[PDB]
Amino acid sequence: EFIVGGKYKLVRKIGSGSFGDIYLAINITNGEEVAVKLESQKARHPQLLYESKLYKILQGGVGIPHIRWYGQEKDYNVLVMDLLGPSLEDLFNFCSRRFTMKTVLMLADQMISRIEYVHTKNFIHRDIKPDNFLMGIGRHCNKLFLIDFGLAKKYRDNRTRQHIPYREDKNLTGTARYASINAHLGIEQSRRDDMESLGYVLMYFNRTSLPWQGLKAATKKQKYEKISEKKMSTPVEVLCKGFPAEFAMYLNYCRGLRFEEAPDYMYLRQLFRILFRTLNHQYDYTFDWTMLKQ
C-alpha cells in the first residue's frame, strides 16, 4: 500500500524519533530490505532534510550508512537508507543489562573511530548514546554504525579550519544521561564533549547504571539540575572505582581538553587496546550477544 521513491514499499514500523518514525521497507524490483525514516512536512521538530545533507558530506566513511533516496511522498519527507541491525541499547537489554570487559573494549575501539570520522568531516554529533550506535546486517554484522545526525553541528570551517566561537548560555542538546559536564553548564559543545559523552556510555555498560540515573523530578528542568550536580559532585575516581584505571584516564583526558583542542584519538584507542592485550583478549568479534546466539 505505501510506496516511497517509486520502488520502496513499507512493511512495518521498526522505530521512532523527534521528526517521526522509522520503517522496514522492501525494494519491489528485487527484494532488497531498507530503512525508511518518515517525517511529516509541517512537523514540530524537522531534521530529515538536514540529515540527508549531512549524510552526503559523511558518505565514504566506514560505519556511515548509505542513503538510497531523499524526497517527498504524500505529506511526508522521506529518507531511504541501509537497514542496520540492533542498537547497543537493544543488545545491552538482550545481554540482561550486562557487558563483559571484552565487549566494552572491542566496542570502545569502533566508537572512538566512528566519532573521529564525523570530526574529520568538521562536525560534532552532540547525541552520543547507546541507541545511536547500531551493528550492521549480514556482511556488516560486526561493524558498528554511528547514526542520527539531526543534532550534528559544524565546529570548524572546512578550508580555514577556524573553530566555532566559545559561547555560554546554551540550552542542553541531546540526552541528559550522557551529556558532558560543560554541556550541562550551558558552555558550547565541541569535539571534547562528544568524547566525554563516549566515556559515560562505556561506564554505563561497565556499571549496570550511572550514579545520576535514578534521579526523579517532576519537570525536565528539575531532572537535569540533579544529573548536572551529581556529575559535578561525582569525582571520575568514584564513578570508575573497581574498573581498570584506563576508564578514569579516558574521562580525565577529555575533561582536561581545551574548547578548540583536538582529541588524540590514537592515545584513547591505545589505552583500551593495551588493556585488551593485558587481559589476554583477541579481537575475534565474539561479543556477549554473539555467544547468547550460540
Place this chain on the structure above:
Amino acid sequence: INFDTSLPTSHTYLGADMEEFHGRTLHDDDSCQVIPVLPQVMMILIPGQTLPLQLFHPQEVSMVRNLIQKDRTFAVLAYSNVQEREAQFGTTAEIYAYREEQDFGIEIVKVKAIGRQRFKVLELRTQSDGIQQAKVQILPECVLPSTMSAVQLESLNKCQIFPCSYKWWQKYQKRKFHCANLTSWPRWLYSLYDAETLMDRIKKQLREWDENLKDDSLPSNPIDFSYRVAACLPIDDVLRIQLLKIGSAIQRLRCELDIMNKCTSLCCKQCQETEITTKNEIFSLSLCGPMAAYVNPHGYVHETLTVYKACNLNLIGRPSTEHSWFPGYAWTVAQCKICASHIGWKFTATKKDMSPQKFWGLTRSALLPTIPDTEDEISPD
C-alpha cells in the same frame, strides 16, 4: 549437480496450477496485423521463449481477459529507446496459461506466454483508455536449401546419404561439399554456412554449460535450435535487437557462435569496466539453458543467468526463501561494489545434501558482454 532442472521451468513460485490452452494462432508471413501492447512489459522476447507475468493494474487485467476471449496474442516491443518508448521491431506473445485471483479484494492475473512471431513495427497508437495497439508486419522465417543444391553433380546424388566424431565430421565435409570444386570456394568455407555443422559447434559449447544430452533436450530444426540458443545468450538489448532482426537460421546460428567466442567477460552495465563473471562460470540450472525469464511478486521480470562464481559484488541483507525461483535455494540481493547497481542475487542451498551449495543469478539488464584486451563490439552475420 543434483537440483532438478525441470523445476525453474514450472514457475511453481506462481502458486496453483494455471488454466491451460491447447489452441495455436499464427499470422500469415508479411501480413499486416493490429496487436495490443502490455504497458509495463520491458523485455525483448525471442520466439519460443517463455514469458511469465503478474498483472495488477485494472487496465492490464481487462486487456488480458479480452485476449483470453480472442486470439490470446499481444505484441512485445523490442525497445531501442525504452524511455521515449521507441521500437522498430518486436515479437508476438501467445498466452498458453493463466490464473485469475482475488488477492486482498483486488483482481490479479498471472499469465504464461510464449514468443511466436517476429515483426516490424509500422505504427504505434495509444488509445483514449491509455492502452496502446501496434500496427505490425509479420517478418518471415527464411529457410535456405543446402549451399550445394544449385552446385551438385547428378552422378554424385546417390553419395549424398551418409552412414570418433572428428573423423565422421571430416567425411561429412568431404562428401557433402565435394561439388565445391565446381565453384570459387573450398569445402571448409561452405562448412561455415552449414546448419548441421554450425549446430554441432554450438552443441559443443552448450555441453560445456549442461550435462544433458543433445539426443532429446536440443531441437533438430535449425530455426528452433537457433531461437532456443538466442533466448539464453547473456547479451545487452542493442545486441539482442540485432539478433531479433535476423531472418535466416544460418545467420542467427553463425552470429550466436561468434558472440559465444568473442564475449568471454560479463561486466556491470553501469560501470562498463567492472567485471562480474566470465563464460567459464556459466552453467544451466534449468532445461532452457543458463538463462530464463522469471517474474517477481510485484510483476518485475528478470532474465536470470545462473553462474558458479561472480566477483565485485556486495551482499545486501540476509538470505530469504520467499518467492524463490530455484526451489530449495534462498536468495540475497547482490549489488556492484563500485556503483551499488543491482546485479542479481546469490542463491544459497537450504539443505546440506544439495549441489551446488551456492551460485549467482544475474539479471541480464544489469550486464554488459565484453571482448577481452582492447577492442569495440561487432556481431558478424
Place this chain on the structure above:
Amino acid sequence: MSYNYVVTAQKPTAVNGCVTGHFTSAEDLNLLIAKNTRLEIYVVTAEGLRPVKEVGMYGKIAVMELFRPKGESKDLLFILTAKYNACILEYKQSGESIDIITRAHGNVQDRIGRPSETGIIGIIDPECRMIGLRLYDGLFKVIPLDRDNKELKAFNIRLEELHVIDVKFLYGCQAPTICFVYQDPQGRHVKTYEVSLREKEFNKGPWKQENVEAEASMVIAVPEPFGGAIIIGQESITYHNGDKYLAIAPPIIKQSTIVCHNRVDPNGSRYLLGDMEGRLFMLLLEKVTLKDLRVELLGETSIAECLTYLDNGVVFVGSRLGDSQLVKLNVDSNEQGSYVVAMETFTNLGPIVDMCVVDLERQGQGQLVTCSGAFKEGSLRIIRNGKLHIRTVPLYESPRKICYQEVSQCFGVLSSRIEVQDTSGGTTALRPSASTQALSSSVSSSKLFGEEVEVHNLLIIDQHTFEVLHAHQFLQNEYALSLVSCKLGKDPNTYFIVGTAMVYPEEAEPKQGRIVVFQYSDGKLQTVAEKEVKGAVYSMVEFNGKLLASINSTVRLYEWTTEKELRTECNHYNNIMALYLKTKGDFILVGDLMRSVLLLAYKPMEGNFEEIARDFNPNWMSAVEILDDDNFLGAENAFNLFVCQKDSAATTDEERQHLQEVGLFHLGEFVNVFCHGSLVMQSTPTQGSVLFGTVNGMIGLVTSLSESWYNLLLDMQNRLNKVIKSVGKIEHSFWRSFHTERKTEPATGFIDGDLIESFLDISRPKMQEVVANTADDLIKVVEELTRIH
C-alpha cells in the same frame, strides 16, 4: 530502373545426360545429348556421329529418357526440367522440315515438399505403363502412361523409407516393380514394391528386404533372361533376384566410387562402369541363371558424368569436369589387352572457376583465358572470336585463379593438386601435373595412411607458348585463395600478390593466413615480402596504388613502403565476412556467401572507411560485379541474376543507405566469375560489357540499355513468345522467372538476348506477325544486337 540485356556468347559445353535409341526413325540409331538447356540429336554412323538436330529448351534438363510404348513405330522422349516441367517429345520430319512436336506436357511440382537429398530420380517402366519420379522425401510420384494423359497428371504414394538412395523399375514383372536402396538407423537395405495404378499405392514386393553394404549407392535392373538387380557399393557388387544372392568384392573398384553405368548387350550380359577418377570398367555376367560376376578395368577416360555404348566397340563419354569423348574399345582381339583409345574429343570449358580478358594478339580484339575443369581434367582455355576459336592447355590439376601480367608477358595461376599420404611420412602425387612439371620450381620456407592432401601452388605460364615457366609451392595446410597482379605505392615493379589461409581439420574458422608479394623478373620468381594475418585472406584488390585485402570479417588497406613492406593504413570491421571485394574509384563492394551486400567509400581526408549503403536478403550468392557507380550485378541461388541500385540523390538518410533491387532473372546457369571485357573489336544501342563464366562452361554477356530500347525489346519478347514454338510447351516467362523454392517472381530489368536473337531464325510469315504494330527494319535492330558478342 536498370535496363539490362543478357546474351549467350558460348552455349553450355558440359554434358549432364546422354541416351541411345530410335528417336528420328525406327531404323536409325540415335545419340541424344543433354547440355543443360540444350538437347543434341545425332545419328550413329560407322564413321562417327552425324548431327541431325539441335534444340534449346526453356528449362534445365533434369531427366531425359527414351521409351517405346505399345503401338508406337519409334521411341518417344520424356524430359523433366529442374522447374518440374514434364513433357513427351516426338521427332517428325517431312522432306527437309524438322520439328520436335510435343505429345504431352505438364508441371509436376507439389505445393508441399522437401526436395530430396539424392536429387531428382526419373525412371520409366520396361512395359511403358508409367513414369516414376522421386522429387521429394517420403513420396513417390507416379505418371500413368496412357494416350489420355496429355496433361501428365500424377499421384503420390507415401514412402515410409524417407532416405532413398537409388531406385529402378525391375524387368520380368507382371506388375510394375520398383527396387531401391534406402538408409535407416540399422543401415542400408534393398527393398521392392509393386505399383498399383488402380489402387494408387504400393503392394508387397516380389522378394524380401535384404541387408546390403554400408556404402551401397547404385541399383541396376538386369533385363531378361537374368532378371533381378545388381547393387553397387564402395567395396562390393552384389546380385539379388530373390532367393538368388551372388556377391563379389573386387579390389580393382576399391580405389574410387563407381558413379555411372551403361548396358552394352541388350540381354544385360555386359555393363560399362565409370568411377569418380575416370577409370572405365566392364562388368560381365556369365550365364537361365547367373553363374558369376566379373569386373575388368578397360582403361582411362575423362571423368564421366554419363556413359553410353553406341556400337562396334564405340562408347560416348559424357563429361561435366573435362572434355567429352568418343572412345573405341578393343574388348575382343584377345592377343592384345583390354584398352581404351580416344577417337574424338569434344571441347568442354566447364566448370569455369575463374577467367580474365587479355588483348594478347590484335591489340584491339580481346581474348578470354579461363581456369577450366577440375582434377586431372584441369586446363586453361584460350577463347577468341573467329564461331569461337578455343585453344586448350592441359594442367592435370585444378586451376583456381588467374591474372595476367603484361610487363612479364605471363599469367599467374593458382592451382591445386591432390597427393596421398605415405607410409614413410610425407605425401605422393597421383600423376605428373603442371605444378610438379614446371621448368623451375620453388617452395615456401616452413615453420615449427592413404589420406588425400591438397597442395597449393602459384604457376607462372608464358603468354605465347603456355609453358609452365615456374611453380611456387605453398606451405603444408596453406590454402591459396586470392591472386592479384599490380604496382603498389611509388614502386615501379609489377608484382603477383597471393592471399592465403592456414587450414587444419580441427579448426572450423581460419585463425592464420598470409599476404605474399612475389616478383617474376629476369626469368626468375622471388618472394619480395610476406605479411602474416590473423585470418583467411578471401579477396584482394589493387585500390588506388594500395592493396585492399579482406581478412575474415575485416577489410584492411595496406600501403607499400619504400622499405618494400605492407603497412596497415586503415581497418574496417564488418557485420559480414568479406568474401567478395570489388572497387570502382574510391567505392568498395563487400559481399558475402549469403547475399549480404555492403557499399563502402574510402575517406582520404580521414584515412578510414565509411559505409554508404547495404542490402541483406539471405540467399546463396556465387558472384558479384560493379556495373557502374550506381548498379551492382550479382549471381544468386537457383541460377538467377540480380541487379541492386543506389540513390545518392535521396532526401532521407534511410533511403540513401538502402539498395534497391531493380533487376531479377532466371539465367539457368551458375556464375563463378564476372569479368569486364569484350571479345569483339574495340552510336551503339548498348553501354558496357560484363562477361561471365559458369559451372556448365557457358559464357554469357551483360550490357545496359536505354529505357526506349528496353521497352521496345520487352514488347518484342511478348510478341516473339506468341509465335515461337517452345519444346515441351514451356512458357518463356515461367522459365525466366526469378526462382528459389520459397519464391517465384517474374523477371524484371532484363532482356533475354537469346530470345531477341532468335527473331533472325523465324520464318518470313512469322516475322511479319511479330512486326504487326517493316520486318526488315527489325532485322537491322537484331543484327546490330548480335554484334556485341
